[PDB]
Design an enzyme around this catalytic site. Sequence first.
Site, PDB file in Angstrom:
ATOM      1  N   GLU A  11       0.784  -1.243   0.000  1.00 58.39           N
ATOM      2  CA  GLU A  11       0.000   0.000   0.000  1.00 58.39           C
ATOM      3  C   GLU A  11       0.810   1.284   0.000  1.00 58.39           C
ATOM      4  O   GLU A  11       0.275   2.343  -0.335  1.00 58.39           O
ATOM      5  CB  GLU A  11      -0.881   0.002   1.266  1.00 58.39           C
ATOM      6  N   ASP A  20      -6.253   6.791  -4.787  1.00 59.94           N
ATOM      7  CA  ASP A  20      -5.702   5.465  -4.959  1.00 59.94           C
ATOM      8  C   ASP A  20      -5.816   5.124  -6.438  1.00 59.94           C
ATOM      9  O   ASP A  20      -6.240   6.005  -7.188  1.00 59.94           O
ATOM     10  CB  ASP A  20      -6.380   4.493  -3.994  1.00 59.94           C
TER      11      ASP A  20
END
Length: 162
Positions: A11, A20
Amino acid sequence: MNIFEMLRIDEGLRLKIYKDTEGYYTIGIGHLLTKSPSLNAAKSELDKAIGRNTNGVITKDEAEKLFNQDVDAAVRGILRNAKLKPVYDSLDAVRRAALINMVFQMGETGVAGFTNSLRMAQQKRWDEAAVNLAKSRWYNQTPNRAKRVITTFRTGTWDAYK
Ligand SMILES: [Cl-]
Ligand SMILES: [Cl-]
């Protein structure tokens, strides 16, 4: 290797609001703030989550705080899910981390629809599961990560993460 290091690798860590891979506002170690296109909205969700007026910037500690909560929530979500729990409890510790990873990324729900892959894994048919997992939007949108997670599930080792 462990669940924390595993997701920190997948991540990354960003201290400022960012979008994202799906374009949604996120912060820290993959902590989704909102599906809404509003940055103000996102900033609102951030302040509420942290407990202060952040102005869209948090410290390392705040990020790691959210991460712990998120991991804990993930796991509890699995144990509370009827579809998931039995798979989870059937697995060794390494493969369990692979399933936490998936839930963290996609939600309980999203994962509970890998029904078929879920069944093969329960049966310990690793290769077949691996192939089935790959037939997915997940794999086609984030293939490198998805490969790492899928090799983990398949082998039961941390090789993909070295
Ligand atoms: Cl929160
Ligand atoms: Cl990826």
